[PDB]
Symmetry: D2
């Protein structure tokens, strides 16, 4: 009953640490849902990856939106899309925001990097962008999460903060502060400086050893597990493909994998079996 | 080098047993190519399932073609698409055949069942024998690449009609131009396949899917003279397995520490995406 | 404003004779709204044609839905889509309906011909109309059932037997079609229908019959089915032939709209104002 | 004879060639039935028919699909107005590949900044590499890359129109589209004097349309693009037909001023399908 946009809104603004898991297609979206996660992360790298292309705007934004439409169709929990820089200027970003709203997607995460191709995009430009998105939403609960690439690009806390504040002031519903460092330093230094001006979102891929409660004490609002399903999937597929190739039989894979009937259950095949008995004449 | 259509055509007509592996997206199509496989099976179940829908004509034929376009861009070996019934009558089938050729797809597999399902131990009626035969012919008459392949999937055994139907249909489709016949069975044993091969007298290449009777020694297929085997959906199933387990572990743990060393690295993904080429090209084309 | 679905339902249930005009792409949808029409008919023949294909389900349903997404994005009045037979069985229909809602389309018209002169089984099609009514999430989304009995050669008995089956199944309106050059089939149906539900007609073949005669018969709505497409084609043919021969633009430049008119139709204006506000000076 | 080959031949030929604009499958077939040897897939025309603005709103794959349909409905080549390639050199090459597979004979690219951040034009050096990048990726040697120079539209001199034009020609361009917003061919005449027949030249005489055609043959121009007239003509017929039916609530005043339904079935090649249904359905 609760709108997906709204569910994501509540998680960002909640005073408790929330988690969203990555998914990259309709199938993974259902699995993340059944597992119990309260939200899905539409990973830009995972989506371009499963398509077999590079994470550098190769697939058009509409090809990415369609993958997300199928993902949205197969889940009841909100999906926060990793939308790069919005695939163009403020106009492309607002057009994207309206299409996602209509597809059932709950929010979009935009970063302040240059597009296409450590200078980044102008703060005022990217601020006007968030604001454009914010002024274009037809659903007040759709979320725009601003991602600051200051630390990653080599700038200091100063650049980060200045950016986060400009974005939060433009209307961002949350700030995703990232760091490629192997520990949470840029983040702890940010958390102190931030002053809790708004919910903060982190991607602990590189400092994954840092305990999670440490994120609770820093006041962090939401954590993103960024790409582990794509990575888990590739390993399993590489393994099974090698296994079958070498064996020239299925004897060594059949019991190490999900049955065909578990596939049908995930596709909700029974609902159709039942609709067909009710809708197909005698 | 050699056209993908030609590579698939040579596999279908070769004397030895050939194998093709299931892929359902660009990523899995590259992994299959890397493993050494000489071809890819564009599984209908695997494609619809990754999209999250049922294997019953929900995604449009152009949404399926699009998934396959990515698969073909990411692989050098032929892809044989499971094209259900051609998505309509003979006219929809030839239009599909033209789009697949243009997309780099090597062939299409069409099955003789009714479409769409209009009716809810009596055998299940299939398509009219003369009608399906003409659809195969319409496709052969329409393809622009002489080596594109039309594989005819016979549903007789599965639908409850014995060997008698299976052979009349296979003969009718082969005679209509099919490049190969795919004989399937509901059984957990190869008996239907065995009986058909015995009666077929090698009138044309035969393709099979050992999914339900997987314990059957592979050498036995070679003895029947089967031309190709299709490993139908195991990459999709291994993926579900891996994603269900990785998700549950991170959900429970609320940390990555217990999965980080059981999945490939992010750099492995970059290599599958051929990130290196982009690097080298931006060096050659960016001021 | 009010929901497009609701606008269409009110027009069908209205006691006034309503009119919806054919559009086949984003541009034509926009022109139809500006003219004043309270609704748009997403003609199956027009969409197919503009794409350069036959009206025999050659382009796919998602390709047709995308054309309509652009049309819906470009208009404020409801678009009723000609969805042929729903592009498959009941399941394909209910999936289609769901996507049309999400894209802003107001309703869909489904015909009882066989897919891909016998028609689809009555019960089967009725159960399909039902599946759509049971699946739609916007209660105002309109499902229009098109009876092809008269065109199929059958008689008034069939047309009636089928109109009643479909309406009892939940259809929001019945489109009664005839190939005749006079309204004989339509007047006979209306006489024996006893107003069991709103009726929709397409006066394409009997366009000489005064429109007031339909009002008198109690017809709820009329569809101008393909005139903008036919108009666009005869102008493009003449424009192309004139430039081709002349090898010059001097003899067409004054018979066609200026490029400024095109920009206005694109709401290019709103973007300039937007770039003015969102792009840093 | 390949479509790509057919185009290249028109660009490097002796006579002045003409290509007429089309924006969908239906208009492409009309352009062909009329006798034109080529089709101009107008950016303005394609986005307009979709009802969006000519500013990169429709994704590049959405544009490619429209062109795919046009391609299937015509036997003569189509030169596609591809903005700046929809991204950097990489986006540009991917577009070229997909265009070749779709049967498009060529892409026309312009030397401007993308996206808009608003007159500076694209770095001369970068566009040159962009042009090259596309040339190096072709799989068909006869696929044409037309470089459109905006110097004169950007407000630069002839010295800049020739500087860019010569650079893009050395990069690989198959032709040079010199455009001028003047209502006379002065700019075109000036550039033609300067150019020194270093490559085929294409012009868009939309504004200076009173200029006699032989004048263009004289200067040595290789091809003329009738840029947007079928769209404009269509729009006139639609606004008029629509107004006429709205007012009269009848079709008696348009039924004799429009083509017939049979004519539509003919243009759709309906008879070709009847013949097929004949031979392929029991
Ligand atoms: Mg990303
Ligand atoms: Mg299948
Ligand atoms: Mg129709
Ligand atoms: Mg342009």
């Amino acid at each position: 009953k609760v709108k997906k946009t709204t569910q994501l809104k509540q998680m960002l603004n909640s005073k408790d640490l929330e988690f969203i898991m990555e998914a990259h297609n309709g199938l993974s979206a259902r699995i993340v849902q059944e597992a119990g996660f309260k939200g899905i992360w539409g990973s830009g790298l995972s989506v371009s990856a499963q398509l077999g292309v590079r994470d550098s705007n190769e697939a058009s934004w509409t090809q990415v939106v369609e993958v997300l439409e199928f993902m949205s169709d197969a889940s009841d929990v909100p999906i926060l899309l990793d939308a790069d820089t919005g695939y163009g200027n403020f106009n492309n970003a607002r057009r994207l925001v309206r299409k996602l709203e209509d597809r059932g997607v709950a929010g979009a995460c935009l970063e302040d990097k240059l597009f296409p191709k450590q200078p980044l995009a102008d703060i005022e430009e990217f601020a006007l962008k968030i604001k454009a998105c914010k002024d274009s939403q037809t659903d007040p609960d759709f979320c725009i999460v601003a991602r600051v690439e200051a630390f990653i690009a080599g700038w200091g806390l100063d650049e980060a903060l200045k950016r986060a504040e400009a974005y939060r002031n433009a209307g961002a519903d949350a700030i995703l502060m990232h760091s490629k460092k192997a520990d949470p330093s840029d983040i702890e230094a940010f958390m102190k400086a931030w002053n809790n001006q708004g919910p903060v979102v982190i991607v602990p891929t590189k400092y994954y050893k840092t305990p999670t409660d440490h994120f609770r004490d820093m006041g962090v609002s939401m954590v993103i597990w960024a790409n582990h399903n794509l990575r888990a999937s590739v390993s399993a597929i590489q393994q099974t493909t090698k296994q079958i190739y070498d064996d020239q039989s299925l004897v060594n894979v059949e019991d190490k994998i999900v049955s065909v009937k578990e596939i049908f259950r995930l596709q909700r095949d029974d609902e159709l079996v039942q609709a067909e008995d009710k809708y197909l004449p005698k």
